[PDB]
Amino acid sequence: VKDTYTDRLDDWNGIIAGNQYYDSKNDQMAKLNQELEGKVADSLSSISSQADRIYLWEKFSNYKTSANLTATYRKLEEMAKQVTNPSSRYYQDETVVRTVRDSMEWMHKHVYNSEKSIVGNWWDYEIGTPRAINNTLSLMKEYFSDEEIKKYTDVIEKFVPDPEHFRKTTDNPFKALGGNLVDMGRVKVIAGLLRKDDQEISSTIRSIEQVFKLVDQGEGFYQDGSYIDHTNVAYTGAYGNVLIDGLSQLLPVIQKTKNPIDKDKMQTMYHWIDKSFAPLLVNGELMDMSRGRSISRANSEGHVAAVEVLRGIHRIADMSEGETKQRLQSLVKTIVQSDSYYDVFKNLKTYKDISLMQSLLSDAGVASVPRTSYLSAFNKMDKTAMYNAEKGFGFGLSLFSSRTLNYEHMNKENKRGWYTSDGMFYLYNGDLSHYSDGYWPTVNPYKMPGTTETDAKRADSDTGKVLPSAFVGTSKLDDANATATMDFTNWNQTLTAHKSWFMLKDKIAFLGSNIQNTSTDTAATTIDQRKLESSNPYKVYVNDKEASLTEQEKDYPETQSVFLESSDSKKNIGYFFFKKSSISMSKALQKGAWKDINEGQSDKEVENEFLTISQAHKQNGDSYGYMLIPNVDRATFNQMIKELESSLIENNETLQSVYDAKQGVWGIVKYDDSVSTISNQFQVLKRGVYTIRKEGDEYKIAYYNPETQESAPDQEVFKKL
Ligand SMILES: CC(=O)N[C@@H]1[C@@H](O[C@@H]2OC(C(=O)O)=C[C@H](O)[C@H]2O)[C@@H](O)[C@@H](CO)O[C@H]1O
Fold first, then answer.
1. What is the whole-number distance in angstroms between the Cα of residue 241 and the centre of ligand 1?
2. Cα 300 to chain centroid, rounded
3. Ligand 1 mean position to 412 CA, how many Å?
4. Domain boundaries of the chain, sorted by first residue
5. Beta-carbon contacts of residue 68 (< 8 Å; ≥ 6 apart)
6. Is 124 a pocket residue for ligand 1 (Cβ < 6 Å)?
7. Residue nearest to atom 9 of ligand 1 (CA)
8. How many CB atoms lie within 10 A of CB 470?
9. Ligand 1 pocket residue status of 166, Cβ below 6 Å
10. Atom 13 of ligand 1 has which residue's CA nearest to it?
11. Catalytic one of 239, 538, 541, 671
12. Impact of changing residue 230 to A on the protein?
């Protein structure tokens, strides 16, 4: 019955597949089409023989394993996309039409129907499979009757009758929010359309509108740009991806129903883009510290995941108008063009998304200007993102506190992310491929960069924990200067350390004090564990003298500096130790497989060479202190360390401070309320984090008490002498 419902479904098909936009003369489109051709070809030659068949596909035959249901229906969706694509060799193919129809019927009878109960993961039964069924039926609606479409979607109403909750048929349902809530839309809004059910469409849209509300607690988007999911996990880069990706697909359809969403309610989407997503995108890569367990998926490395967000942003820009549309187009364009490592088209999986990107990149009317410097203090999720446009490097600080979980290990994914939030840092430089090409399965999980830990063995079965302390946070002064601290205690309460960071425009100082260890395990701080490029080797210098690193660890006592020299100055990394320190370094090939950190991934061996720098802490009360200076050549680095000779103000159990004489900026962390006199110019009076700038006889102050998550009147925390 061609009606308004089918009209909406046509729009939906144009969004999730876009065959109407296909052009065989379009190189990028032909590439996606050919990819679908091969997938359909493979599925057809392996699908089971309707003569006493026990399954459709042998590799997805154990229907006790819920993932097999979703994988099975997704193969049918691929067939639907090609049977409706005029340029596919399967266009209107009678055998494919019958295969989809017969497969739907078979699964309906023996595997997935209203009489079944959830076996395995609820997600497959309520989101993955319903979405695949909806899309298959929508795309091939001209090959199914309304009665058949209602028949194959009855099961969706059984497992997902309520647009506000998921797991409704289990003994522990939950409130749908964020990414999940958006998927609720892709399940019930589309099913509603297919079933011509007005109440389902309207009630579901009403539920979805909740996603536009910013929260000050719990899961969702925060005013400061943070995004929390799974109760207390920083998750902008995975669940937030799903949210923006899925919502941008749905909106064009929703806005054409009889229950469009108010334009002012949707205004917060622009806030997510500018506050939450943009800061996490550096040279086309989505910062891993925001992606949770997804970092353990081989097909979803940083640049790939970034496209999930970018394609969503672009669709939103396309449905916008005037300057809002223009500014968003410019954001997408500059980010994509800055990525010389990843081909954006590799993750634009529909013809419309491809078409949109191509027009964007060729439209001289859309400005593409390098992004300016910024520094986001995501205090509500304990992450900080810094970007310096003049020098061209990004910096990510991954922490956690009494308010957030350190790492997420679930669904057998991210088995070794134990220390990815123990003060771990990320450096985004000229090597855009650093955290890609197998970084996650080959990096030594016991030596995550920036972390202070003991060498005790950890079990893959362990799960995340929150921090005993709430004293973790960042005080931001401006777009280039901020200070952070973390009252760190390790997983088994055998080691502590006051870890602080001083972001000073073109460098970051790392200070650690009060390092205590009560175990018999050895303790140390990993200064860095950098993944190398066989094409761009580094020349290593210690105290400005060339060193030859080996697989075997070598000790370097009385170290003043370490410099990693590349042919490209934008890959250079220098470490300046305020006080001569005893460190050790090595360069070795590290092997591993994605399956080691994610049960569902390939066991194929992967390997990468890593340069590891460490500093042992053999006595209680130990400390470390060094300045990370990226993107400058050797001579400039050497010149800079002399300028910084007296930059360390203090690094003890109650006070940690670094001074940037060139900028006239101080970074200060106080663990108690004693009066601290700084550089004989002023005093700071309260426990907390400070970033101060002197401009003449004037002083600009940025104070933050991480525990109460509040600042305070200037006179309460600052006094000029
Ligand atoms: C955010 C997240 O990790 N969601 C899990 C699912 O992963 C997402 O799957 C899809 C999709 O369209 O199916 C898109 C995303 O890129 C990917 O992160 C999936 O792993 C699912 C399996 O049960 O569990 C979700 O929590």
1. 10
2. 10
3. 13
4. 1-373, 379-635, 636-721
5. 60, 61, 62
6. yes
7. 242
8. 16
9. no
10. 128
11. 239
12. Almost complete loss of activity
Q: What are the b/e assignments for 59-79, b being 16+ CB within 10 Å?
A: ebeebeebbbbbbbbbbbbbb
Sheet holding 383-388, edge to edge: 374-378, 383-388, 393-398, 424-428
103-115 residues labelled b (16+ CB within 10 A) or e (exposed): bbebbbeebbeee
The DSSP letter of residue 446 is T
Nearest to 449 by CA among 489, 404, 397: 397
Question: How many angstroms separate the CA atoms of 599 and 591, rounded?
Answer: 17
Burial class (CB in 10 A: 0-12, 13-18, 19+), 488: buried
CATH of domain 636-721: 2.60.220.10
Please name the residues in contact with 665: beta carbons below 8 A apart, sequence gap of 6 or more: 477, 481, 504, 505, 659, 691, 692, 693, 694
Sign of the torsion angle spanned by Cα atoms 410, 414, 416, 419? negative
Query: Which residues contact residue 510 at a Cβ distance below 8 angstroms, ignoring those fewer than 6 apart?
Result: 425, 450, 499, 500, 501, 527, 624, 625, 626, 627, 628
Residue 415, CA distances (Å) to 219, 296, 406 in order: 23, 8, 13
φ, ψ (nearest 5 deg) of residue 309: -75, -50
Class of the CATH domain delimited by 379-635: mainly beta
Q: Tell me the CA–centroid distance for residue 590 and ligand 1, in Å.
A: 29
**Which residue has tokens 């209203």?**
114
Q: Which of 242, 248, 249, 288 to mutate to test the pocket of ligand 1 (most atoms within 8 A of CB)?
A: 242
Cα(first)–Cα(last) distance of the chain, in Å?
A: 82
Entry resolution (Å):
1.8
State if residue 564 touches ligand 1 by the CB under 6 angstroms criterion: no
> SS3 of 648, please?
strand
* Method used experimentally: X-ray
Measured in Å, residue 71 CA sits from the centre of ligand 1 at 12
Domain 1-373: give its CATH superfamily: Chondroitin AC/alginate lyase (1.50.10.100)
Catalytic, 538? Answer no
Ligand 1 atom nearest the C-alpha of 238 is 1
Label the pairing between strands 393-398 and 424-428: antiparallel
- The whole-angstrom separation of Cα 672 and Cα 338 is 44
In the residue annotation, 271 being an active-site residue is answered as no
121 lines ligand 1 (CB under 6 A): yes
Residue 230 annotated in active site: yes
What per-residue string of b and e applies to 367-382 under the rule 16 or more CB within 10 Å gives b? ebeebeebbbbbbbbb
For ligand 1, the distance from its centroid to the CA atom of residue 253, given in whole angstroms, is 23
592 three-state secondary structure: strand
